[PDB]
Design a protein around this ligand. Structure first.
Ligand code: GET
Ligand code: GET
Lengths: 203, 141, 260
RNA sequence: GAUAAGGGAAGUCGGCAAAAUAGAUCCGUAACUUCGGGAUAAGGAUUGGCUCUAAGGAUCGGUAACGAUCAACUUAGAACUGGUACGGACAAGGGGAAUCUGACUGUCUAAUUAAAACAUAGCAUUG
RNA sequence: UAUCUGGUUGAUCCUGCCAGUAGUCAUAUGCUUGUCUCAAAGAUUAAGCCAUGCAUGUCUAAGUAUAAGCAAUUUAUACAGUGAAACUGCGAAUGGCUCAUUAAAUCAGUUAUCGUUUAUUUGAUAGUAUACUUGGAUAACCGUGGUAAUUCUAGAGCUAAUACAUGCUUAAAAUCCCGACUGUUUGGAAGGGAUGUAUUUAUUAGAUAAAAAUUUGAUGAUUCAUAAUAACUUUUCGAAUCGCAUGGCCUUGUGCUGGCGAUGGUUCAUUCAAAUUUCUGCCCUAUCAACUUUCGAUGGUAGGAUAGUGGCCUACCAUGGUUUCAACGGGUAACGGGGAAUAAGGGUUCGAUUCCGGAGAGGGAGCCUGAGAAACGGCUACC
RNA sequence: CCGGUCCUGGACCCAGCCGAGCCUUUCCUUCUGGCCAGGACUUUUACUUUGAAAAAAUUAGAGUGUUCAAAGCAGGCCUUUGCUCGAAUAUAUUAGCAUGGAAUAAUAGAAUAGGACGUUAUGGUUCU
RNA sequence: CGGCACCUUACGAGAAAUCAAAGUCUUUGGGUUCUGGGGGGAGUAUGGUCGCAAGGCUGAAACUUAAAGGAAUUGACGGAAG
RNA sequence: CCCGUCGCUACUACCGAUUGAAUGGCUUAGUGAGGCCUCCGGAUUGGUUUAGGGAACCGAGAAGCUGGUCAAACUUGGUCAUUUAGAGGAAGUAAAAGUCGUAACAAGGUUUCCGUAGGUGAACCUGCGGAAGGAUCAU
RNA sequence: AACAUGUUCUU
């Protein structure tokens, strides 16, 4: 089938090599998963040594990390907005490693509000102001108020990340390999990398 | 020479710059010592280039054989071919003939190499179709 | 070649087994076990070609099927068990004990030992590192693993192990002045004492040694088996010769002298 | 002026007449040769519609490698889609191997002969 | 034994070859052939084609026994002995044959894996926050059969497990997050969760240049080992198995208990392997001088795939890589090597073939199973 | 030569060979602990020495009345309820590794000085 | 000092003729290029290449054959000389 | 002593119309078996398990279908190599005593030979330049 | 001035 041998290629001098042996099973390849966004379907692959791989054919949700805050939650993936290696993966929403994706920003919002007491979005419309007034006037016992005070000072976050919380979708980078592990995991874009990808996107 | 000159973001793996940690609000930079007595260059440590195949600022280890040779091409992006001259002994005639081999090796942007210079290259994992060596030291041509 | 070889040709068997050429096509193939294939002596060779306790391999099978034969005290029935360096072979039915030790000529001599002696052995430290749950262990040259060793032990050190509980009795630090015994090379079977060690980073370390008679001989570090703490005191019994090489004319002189 | 099962020049002095080929892009192209050619040799593939992607500019304003405004139709690629259609009408070479003959382009028997005939450059002779 | 002799001339000295001479573990052939020890043997042409038979099977006391199989009545009305069949497990990837392909390929010595997989062996190694022990299938078997025919099998009725799927039996204190009340300059507290080990991602330990105004492993070298935090998973496994002896304790209940073992199991180590891999080294040929790069050639970034590195493959980008120190192309009556024959020395010639490495099973390709095969005494397809 | 003779034995003289160490303007790295063991630096090569290691079989070669021998790796002993020497050694090395030497043959250096030393020279700027 | 040569010798070289190099070469090594390997077939055939052509350069094999050849000696012969 | 043409015979090789023939390798294009992956499908089957008659909705799932991927093989064309038929043509070699002349060896009766160019049954002759390996080391 | 030729094979 698909093969990874180096014998079928030309030498560095440019000579066309002669056939040495028939194809060997220890040098096979297989078909790309071409993971998509949809209801979960994961197929096992029996590999060498009796080990197992997982071809994520379709995935709904991934475990994403807010690196600075030291917390990660099992959000859900909206779409693919940028791929460094091929615009055909973004145009068809194909999930591989290093794909720039938008995830649901909601669970990180809940964690922010529960572990701090402040809110994000910062937009001053009707629903945004209503939710802000609700959050600022929540019911907090004195010990939880003091532990949140011990969590104060560093409450504010970088202006680029929280600005996007108006839309309920953040920007992330896939760090797992869905075709190899069956997981579609990543981390929130932050700082210099975030500015780079925003520059690439808005353009 | 722009560091982020690709379609992807260039960074070292798992070196995180927490943008609000305490006081070191700088892009943290990792390196190693390649061992065997070889000196880590200063342009590698206080530098900004990103090279997954750098012996110092990358994830490749040096091990195996150490070779030296003369640089005959720098016409490739971040790799070189060196020329090793040697004499082959022919016992029937009790004499020698001049023989040579060409070796391709990775050259980190920490170095400034040009045709005519003598390099030392250490063996690394196969990082290309032809490359199994990596510049460690540069001398005058 | 599609998978692991299960036969060993007679001419490909290690020479230190002294296997005669014309017996037959094949040789015992030592099973996977504690020692390397080449640097071990399978039990069928030990119990047939050395002691002549059996006329052939079928009788070797019969002998070991009756719980007679033991390695390191434990009972073994694998006819091709890779018995190797420092292994202790117990034969209670005959009331006899042995220890595989390199005679100076380069082989495994038939070294008889006592029952009190046949209850311990020695082990070189391959490496020291932390396992799961941070528990430290050291790996020995016989595939034995021991947890919670002395926090000072490092590689190239010899440890004493009791053959019953698998516990470590006492050990040796590797430094100049130690009685040793070469494990490979041309200097096989000979007993020396450490003189100096030369450290080549990335290469193979070199060690300088001296026999009781003044002879300086160098050897790869990986072939050095510490056997004592000082000169003249091994931690096991030594064969007829005490591991000193004698030239061919010397041995011829001694043979004539002994025989009259 | 059209079409025709199966065959495919067996018809005929003779493939006469008809058919077949045909635009464009990409690939590939022999003998022979006066080295210029032969050559569109031969022989293959592609071509619609729709939705996109990329490239190629002008004028102003002081690492301007930038912004602002304007602007023409060419080129290349991808997804989707249909009774596999698509140079959809129109327009538009059949090809190869050789022999005789005149070098070639050119010219003549208006009204039965366009040719191998005439001319021609080149060559020679004569006054 | 470091050796020569005959042949051009009427005669001579030379060049020069032809001839003679001796070996060959070098093959054929002729003639002849009493004894013993040892011994190669369809390689060379045809990796041409093959009738027939055999070459791979496998049970211990310790997986599963209502043979309607055999023996006798026995510490055994659940069986217990011997032993077909069948299920399960393991092996069949070893061996043996051959030399067709193959010219930096194979191979040899020498390296590397800080670049990976590994049944087995041997060491270790998991108390993790209905349980006097859960279900339902099928074979074996009796029974109706169908086809000309094959190691073809269909309907129907039972019935098992170390087969298949499920599922509890449980310590001890301790840490952390959430936290209704509450003390009141910042305490306590009810009540909820996570505790192992696997999986994936992210972030922190993983330190050790010498004096003023605390614990920490290895390496030449690491993002190593190991550890922590937050989360993740079509939830990996932390034993519903088996044989012989049957002991000890009484608070005498078919009570609490406990001896050698079989088998199995996660991770690490080891061992047997494997897959890549560094450096140097191949015969003839220029009537082969340029080759490679469309459709990967040389390199960079990102991914996909792999057990894993790597143009191994894809996307974008750069224009590189080899060569008279012989590239590339062509020939080989070319598998490589250890070796063999002859041998003053230096050499010449041979090596299909007792060992090692590779490759193949008519030619090609593609796969299943399995730790391991691109297997052919396995399958699938074409010729 | 003492001669000291049981082939061989000691201080002294003689010479010969293979070596070391100091001194001669003096090469021969350099600090720390304080003749080893952890740091800071090293112009590159060829050549030659020595060594580590390098499958058996084959080769050369030591032991053995296979009755001889080719071979094989055995066998021999007062005759046992046992005892016994063995299964040598060199050859391998083009390439790689480690190592002594500095002849021979190369390579580098200070010339628009951008040169060398200042140990505990002096001042200034940075880091840890 | 450089050059074109010559005469004698023969230590030396050589099969000899002869040679001041054709010496310093079995007492065999200063550096380096080219060419030959018995006689023919044959500088032929074929492929390539240069040339307007004539040709030049490169350049085989099948097959055939016991000599061909060099230098000198004695004779014989000469439409050679004395 | 000896040269070439010519005559008889035998053997080897070469050129040659036949867009000759055959065999083996590589390859564009066209078609394309089969497996693997993927995609739906849903004969059949047990119930995430629950319904007065059973109506939901769980699980397992064969054939087949979509799109890929590896790609045997066939046709066509191309190219490379190796054998090989062929009218006729032109050589070479061998083979006691065939024909024609006599080119060379002596000043070989025109000294011989080299290169080149013409001519001629054949050896060969002639022109131009060269050599002595000359028949002159010399006036 | 002219002057061409000499079957084969040896002892
Ligand atoms: C018409 N010219 C011719 C020329 O063709 C050639 O002639 C050859 C001639 O040499 C050949 O002759 C060949 O073969 C013959 C045969 C008897 O063996 C012998 O004379 C000899 O071996 C050999 N020369 C002959 N067989 C053909 C002619 N055309 O040479 C001579 C010539 C007169 O010039
Ligand atoms: C010396 N030149 C000669 C020329 O003279 C000629 O010679 C023939 C020769 O060939 C004849 O001889 C030939 O023919 C005869 C027979 C077949 O006739 C054969 O037996 C003989 O072996 C063969 N050589 C011979 N008999 C007469 C000479 N003149 O042959 C041609 C030639 C070679 O050019």
């Amino acid at each position: 089938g698909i093969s990874r041998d180096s014998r079928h290629k030309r030498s560095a001098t440019g000579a066309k090599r002669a056939q040495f042996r028939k194809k060997r099973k220890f040098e096979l390849g297989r078909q790309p998963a071409n993971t998509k966004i949809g209801p979960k379907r994961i197929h096992s692959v029996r590999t060498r040594g009796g080990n197992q791989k997982f071809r994520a054919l379709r995935v709904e949700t991934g475990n994403f990390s807010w690196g600075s805050e030291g917390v990660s939650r099992k959000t859900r993936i909206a779409g693919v907005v940028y791929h460094p290696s091929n615009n055909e993966l973004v145009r068809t929403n194909t999930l591989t490693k290093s794909a720039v994706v938008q995830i649901d920003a909601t669970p990180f919002r809940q964690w922010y509000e529960n572990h701090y007491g402040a809110t994000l979005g910062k937009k001053k419309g009707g629903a945004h102001a209503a939710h802000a007034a609700e959050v600022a006037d929540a019911k907090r016992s004195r010990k939880v108020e003091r532990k949140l005070a011990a969590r104060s000072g560093a409450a504010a976050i970088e202006s680029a990340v929280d600005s996007q919380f108006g839309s309920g979708r953040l920007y992330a980078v896939i760090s797992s390999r869905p075709g190899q592990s069956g997981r579609c995991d990543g981390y929130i874009l932050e700082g210099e990398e975030l500015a780079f990808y925003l520059r690439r996107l808005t353009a | 020479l722009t560091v982020q000159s690709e379609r992807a973001f260039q960074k070292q793996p798992h070196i995180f710059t927490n943008p609000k940690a305490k006081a070191n609000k700088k892009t943290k930079r990792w390196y190693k010592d390649v061992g065997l007595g070889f000196k880590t260059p200063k342009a590698a440590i206080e530098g900004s280039y990103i090279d997954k195949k750098c012996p110092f600022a990358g994830t490749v280890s040096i091990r195996g054989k150490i070779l030296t040779g003369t640089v005959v091409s720098t016409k490739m992006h971040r790799t070189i071919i060196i020329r090793r001259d040697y004499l082959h002994y022919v016992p029937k005639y009790n004499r020698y003939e001049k023989r040579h081999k060409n070796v391709a090796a990775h050259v980190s942007p920490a170095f400034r190499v040009e045709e005519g210079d003598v390099v030392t290259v250490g063996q690394c994992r196969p990082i290309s179709k032809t490359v199994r060596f990596n510049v460690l030291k540069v001398s005058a041509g | 070649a599609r998978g692991p070889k299960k036969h060993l040709k007679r001419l490909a068997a290690p020479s230190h087994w002294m296997l005669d050429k014309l017996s037959g096509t094949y040789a015992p193939r030592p099973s996977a076990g504690p020692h390397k294939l080449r640097e071990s002596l399978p039990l069928v060779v030990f119990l047939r070609n050395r002691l002549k306790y059996a006329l052939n391999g079928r009788e070797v099978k019969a002998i070991m099927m009756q719980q007679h034969v033991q390695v390191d005290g434990k009972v073994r029935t694998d006819t091709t068990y890779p018995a190797g360096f420092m292994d202790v072979i117990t034969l209670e039915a005959t009331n006899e004990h042995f220890r595989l030790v390199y005679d100076v000529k380069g082989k495994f001599a038939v070294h008889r030992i006592s029952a009190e002696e046949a209850a311990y052995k020695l082990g070189k430290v391959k490496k020291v590192q932390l396992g799961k749950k941070g528990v430290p262990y050291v790996v020995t040259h016989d595939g034995r693993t021991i947890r919670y060793p002395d926090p000072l032990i490092r590689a190239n050190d010899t440890v004493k192990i009791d053959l019953a509980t698998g516990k470590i009795d006492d050990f040796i630090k590797f430094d100049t002045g130690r009685l040793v015994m070469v494990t490979g090379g041309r200097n096989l079977g000979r007993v020396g004492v450490i003189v100096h060690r030369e450290k080549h980073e990335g290469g193979f370390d070199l060690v300088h040694i001296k026999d009781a008679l003044e002879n300086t001989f160098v050897t790869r570090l990986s072939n050095v088996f510490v056997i004592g703490t000082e000169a003249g005191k091994p931690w096991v019994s030594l064969p007829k010769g005490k591991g000193i090489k004698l030239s061919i004319s010397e041995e011829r002189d001694r043979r004539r002298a002994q025989q009259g």
